Amino acid sequence: SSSVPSQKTYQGSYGFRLGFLHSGTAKSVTCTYSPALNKMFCQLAKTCPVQLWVDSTPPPGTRVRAMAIYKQSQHMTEVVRRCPHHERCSDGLAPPQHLIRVEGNLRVEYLDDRNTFRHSVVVPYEPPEVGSDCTTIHYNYMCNSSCMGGMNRRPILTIITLEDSSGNLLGRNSFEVRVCACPGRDWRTEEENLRKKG
Amino acid sequence: SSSVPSQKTYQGSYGFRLGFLHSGTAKSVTCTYSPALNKMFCQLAKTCPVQLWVDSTPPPGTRVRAMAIYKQSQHMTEVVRRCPHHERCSDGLAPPQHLIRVEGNLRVEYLDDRNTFRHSVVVPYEPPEVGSDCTTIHYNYMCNSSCMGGMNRRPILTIITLEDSSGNLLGRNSFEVRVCACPGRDWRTEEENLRKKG
DNA sequence: CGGGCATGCCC
């Protein structure tokens, strides 16, 4: 069986989808999202809010999992990891080899798959508070996309899966990520490239 | 006492000096030397011939030591090391944390100073073969100057000391090193910069 | 802050 996890969108019977906050114009904004590219541009080790939207209420015990995969076919089979440098100078529960962290959640779990060796981070699904339409999770990416010996400039996808306590896949979505020093610059560059030569 | 080793030229009573081979014009020549800058430009993990010249014969048991130091005052006190990435994917006698290796010598010693924590690599001094005016040692630099988490774009000096078996300093010389992908390009850039704004 | 250097890599 494949050790490459699915990246195929599956909004499912609960109508699961992701949302992202709008950002300012700054060259080095901390986080910004491109709907045209389905791609988040963000700085390393800084908050990256991702909203979870559903049309129907998931059952009690539903979990929210995040996992990085390399986008390009030629790299899909390689596990996405922290580079050796940031792993060694790493700063609570997260193993230093994990790229993706969740902040501000008391029930975060970090998993190293016994068979596929892939990393993921899981929190309980909470329904939106009354008067809210979505649930926000604060992700952190602990390397730049360019990190030598880690992502090494290879674009990644973040796969968000909604899973019941039994392990059934309820929903899956994904978005591309570039972790970089200047998210505003690089977003504009890539959207201009899309228009000019895409 | 200082943990910063001397970089002061001391040609000494044996008239000790370094020599360097001339190189071609290629953008990515493997090794090239600038007399104006006293600076070697070379590729990582590739041979970097350094000639030892003396006017008088050193005594039996003389040793040749090489050691890297950061050139800029603000970094002199930090030990020059291999970056975490190249340390982890490191390929005989050299500890993977050492930047500088010697190839082709059966009597190489690698030393980690017990008190200053500085790395060095030592070989016996051999007199030039008859019909030769110098002795060539093949050094290898195992990171680029730009390596994240190692030299991190900070220029280094290589200090070559001639030492008798008793530990007396007989001679000291040094040269600046930039380990980079394109030594020919970067040499020309830096010599042009010297002329234009030095 | 935004203009522009930096430098291994471009597949």
Place this chain on the structure above:
DNA sequence: CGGGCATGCCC
């Protein structure tokens, strides 16, 4: 091979 993109950093 040499022209030029790349992208964290410029002190």
